[PDB]
């Protein structure tokens, strides 16, 4: 989210995320007002369940085109640069970045495909730069009549209106597989108490009782303790061993 430069929309980056802990609340500090549309999952309950892999796609698009990044949408960026599947789950986060990706002379490093023979299957990249023959005469690589170069540049300028200023877009995609889930958010904690009847949780173990200093000696890998009657009687504190 804090990278200096994002890739062009047609050559959009692909980032894989696994075996990590993510705190999405910080994502609310990007802009005073920004889009946080989430599909198939409530944003406020992203810190409870977790998935096997996360896919992040980041790029920059014109502001008024931001509505084209959604399932079932149609247009030009939707079908020629980046297409989302109809059965898509995840989130899309787009915010204004006029203070970072605007040149007084005009930015030209951001490119988008304009002409394509057919539409784009969801999650597909097309980096081809071969000339597009609009008509029937094969120009064989010259930008004359009925032959247009498929890539055009957003001449971003700070003097433009809000409808044309650049906007940074990051798409998060989640999924479930038979592989065990690994990307789970933080779980918080609370200070310990001793010699008092309290309700306690230990690594997903509910309980109620009095915690006292223990004389039992677990093995290094041992976590729980069970008595004759097959009930929990000894526990190991996950933070301090």
């Amino acid at each position, epitope marked *: 989210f804090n990278a200096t430069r994002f890739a062009s929309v047609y050559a959009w980056n692909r980032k894989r995320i696994s075996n990590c802990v993510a705190d999405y609340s910080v994502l609310y500090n990007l802009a005073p007002f920004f889009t946080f549309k989430c599909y198939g999952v409530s944003p406020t309950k992203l810190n409870d369940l977790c998935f096997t892999n996360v896919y992040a796609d980041s790029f920059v698009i014109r502001g008024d085109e931001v509505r084209q990044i959604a399932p079932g949408q149609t247009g030009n960026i939707a079908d020629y640069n980046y297409k989302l599947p109809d059965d898509f789950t995840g989130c899309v986060i787009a915010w204004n970045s006029n203070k970072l990706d605007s*040149k007084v002379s005009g930015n030209y490093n951001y490119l988008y495909r304009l002409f394509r023979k057919s539409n784009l299957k969801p999650f597909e990249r097309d980096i081809s730069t071969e000339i597009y023959q609009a008509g029937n005469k094969p120009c064989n690589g010259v930008a004359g009549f009925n032959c247009y170069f498929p890539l055009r540049s957003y001449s971003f300028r700070p003097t433009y209106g809000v409808g044309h200023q650049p906007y940074r877009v990051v798409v998060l995609s989640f999924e479930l597989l038979h592989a065990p889930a690994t990307v789970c958010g933080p779980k918080k904690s609370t200070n310990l108490v001793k010699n008092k009847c309290v309700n306690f949780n230990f690594n997903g173990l509910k309980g109620t009782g009095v915690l006292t200093e223990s004389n039992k000696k677990f093995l290094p890998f041992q976590q729980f303790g069970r008595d004759i009657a097959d009930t929990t009687d000894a526990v190991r504190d996950p933070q301090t061993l």
Partner: antibody
Amino acid sequence: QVQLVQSGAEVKKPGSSVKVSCKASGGTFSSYSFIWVRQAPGQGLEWMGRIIPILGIANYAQKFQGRVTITADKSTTTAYMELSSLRSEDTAVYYCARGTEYGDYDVSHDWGQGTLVTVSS
Amino acid sequence: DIQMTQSPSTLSASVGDRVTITCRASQSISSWLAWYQQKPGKAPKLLIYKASSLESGVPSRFSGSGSGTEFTLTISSLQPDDFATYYCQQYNSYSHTFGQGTKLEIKR
């Protein structure tokens, strides 16, 4: 990665025009842009012009209208500058520098060795 | 046009020393600025673009820091190959201006 080669040093009377070539070798050429920058012996740097041939945008310095024009050839994958109305103070060395789409066009990732152009009688 | 200058014009440094060069423009140029080193007699090589990014192959010791209208390039541990001419260039708006040229030298 990409080798930049310029022309040689040239001596010419001020009443003429000079054409200077710059060839870049390495990677795809269609994603590159060319700037021409000057180096005078008695002071520092001054930029003149930037060219994006694949997108076809030309931008020359405010003090260089009608005097220098820079074009690019796709078949030879080269760049050329022609400068007219040579003045006595215009004796100095030229650097052809190259910018990449991956990054920024204005910045110059690679540089040429330069051409020493001189005018006298 | 943006008129910009760097300080100091000439700085004397030694091997292993930490030094800094400042570069200030007339008005705000956002964060569009690049740094270049020139050994006397050859072409310059870019070091920092966007005033923060480190080029591939450029040693990480060189540090750039700046937001707009003031920028600094700092060297923590200097080596005898760091004595050269340092040049700024802003690329906000057309007519890209350059720097005067700061010479780094040893103490005689």
